[PDB]
Amino acid sequence: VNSFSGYLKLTDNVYIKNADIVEEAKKVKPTVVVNAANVYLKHGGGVAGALNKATNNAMQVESDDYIATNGPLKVGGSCVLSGHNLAKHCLHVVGPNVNKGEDIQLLKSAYENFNQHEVLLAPLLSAGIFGADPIHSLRVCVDTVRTNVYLAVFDKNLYDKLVSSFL
Numbered sequence: 001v002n003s004f005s006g007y008l009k010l011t012d013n014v015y016i017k018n019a020d021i022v023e024e025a026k027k028v029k030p031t032v033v034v035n036a037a038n039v040y041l042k043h044g045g046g047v048a049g050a051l052n053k054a055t056n057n058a059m060q061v062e063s064d065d066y067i068a069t070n071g072p073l074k075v076g077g078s079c080v081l082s083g084h085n086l087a088k089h090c091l092h093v094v095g096p097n098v099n100k101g102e103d104i105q106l107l108k109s110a111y112e113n114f115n116q117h118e119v120l121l122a123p124l125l126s127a128g129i130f131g132a133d134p135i136h137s138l139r140v141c142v143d144t145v146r147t148n149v150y151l152a153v154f155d156k157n158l159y160d161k162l163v164s165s166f167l
């Protein structure tokens with residue numbers, strides 16, 4: 001039993017809600033919140049900008065030190081950093097940005113990172129300003145993640161579309 005509230009069960013291990021991941025994190029303080037990151041951990045907009053702003057830019061400061069030491073992530077890759085005031089940990093996961101010309105097959109690789117964590121609060125990877133088909137992202141999530149994932153989808157209209165079209 002966990003403290004996630006009001007989620008619609010989709011499969012054995014995947015749950016979904018129409019919510020801002022930042023607000024879900026502020027309320028639940030999960031062990032792991034997933035950021036929809038880019039390879040440079042430059043948290044400008046979307047999920048990343050919203051999470052970072054909620055940390056008063058501490059996420060960005062920590063991320064800049066990470067990159068200075070380790071260099072960029074891979075598309076499809078991840079790193080674990082602090083969750084600051086939002087969660088114990090933040091799993092920064094890089095889904096392909098098809099507006100940047102990146103390979104959609106890497107979306108499965110991106111979701112595989114979730115399997116290293118028993119429970120996660122996560123956004124829909126590669127959706128939104130990352131440009132991919134959100135129905136596709138949800139399908140890849142369900143078919144790839146085996147651990148318990150609570151998906152927060154900000155946009156009400158797309159949430160309604162995601163639920164109504166889910167197979």
Ligand SMILES: OC[C@H](Nc1ncnc2[nH]ccc12)[C@@H]1CCc2ccccc21
Pocket residue numbers: 019020021022036045046047048050123124125126127128129130152153154155158
């Ligand atoms: O609603 C669309 C959804 N954005 C969010 N989902 C949940 N909490 C959120 N809080 C702020 C935004 C946001 C998709 C998922 C990945 C991504 C990256 C950039 C923009 C949009 C998106």
